[PDB]
Amino acid sequence: STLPDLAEQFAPPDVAPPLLIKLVEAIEKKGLECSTLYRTQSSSNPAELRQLLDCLDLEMFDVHVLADAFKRYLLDLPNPVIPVAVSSELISLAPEVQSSKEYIQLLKKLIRSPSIPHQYWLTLQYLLKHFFKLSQTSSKNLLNARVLSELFSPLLFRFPAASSENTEHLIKIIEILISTEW
């Protein structure tokens, strides 16, 4: 709620918001192999999780609390990682655009727009790297790229779209972008 805009939390040459780096690195250190990471709610409520996003070393916290604070962070951003301007255009695309490659091309073109601060695309890239690292230990944490897209796309886009052939394409491109990080 008091969480600043992504464009105010950091700037190049930094690669991601410092708070998001702390969360991701703590979660990867403690939960990379956790078979229920991001699929179980912790006991803390939103108010408690937000208190965490202000005050210590995050490794001190329960990994399930960190995972919930990670979700809380994405939800409390004034504008989502993928701005509504971008999602609005992607959803509007006709069925003749059957190509995931085209959807990806358009997301990158739109999100790299000069009207959108570079921090948004940088934050998405950092998150995709995190999701990819998780999917490379799928044999233990059970997370593949598609499930990660289905779990986190509603947090990255923050769009109540009514579910359609368009929404399947957005989930699909996030899936593809996770799997194709390196």
Next chain:
Amino acid sequence: STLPDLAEQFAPPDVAPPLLIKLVEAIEKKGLECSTLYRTQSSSNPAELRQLLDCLDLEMFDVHVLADAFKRYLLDLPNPVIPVAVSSELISLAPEVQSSKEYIQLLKKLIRSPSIPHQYWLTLQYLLKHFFKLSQTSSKNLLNARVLSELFSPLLFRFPENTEHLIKIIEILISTE
């Protein structure tokens, strides 16, 4: 024009773009008393000035070249220091509103909007501080708040009448730092 957006050049807790700080500090060191600062075209063209804004110590350069690079910087920003939405609103209120105090209150309210990165208002504050510093030696450089407003308002707002109210806001904001 590869110049990044103001919001991409720095972020809190930094108070202004690092390149703009270097320009301002060099100009104030070398040209605080120059009777023609910011009113003389130097021999350099935009390409040469951009060469300078794209990368060592700026004090090595002719002060009139630094002044031109300062202007070039404001012109090459992808979005102006005062965003188009803000200027548009202030301009459309031009016939109906007259109070300078109201315009100033509104400029601050609009530019502090959550939809606008804080860097824009921070950069404007830094620029106003520079312009005020110049006006304290106006007897020597001839740059008073009014002259500074007429020179730089078109660069801050990015407008080639209605503007007269905008220029007045910058003048007052320079004078009251």
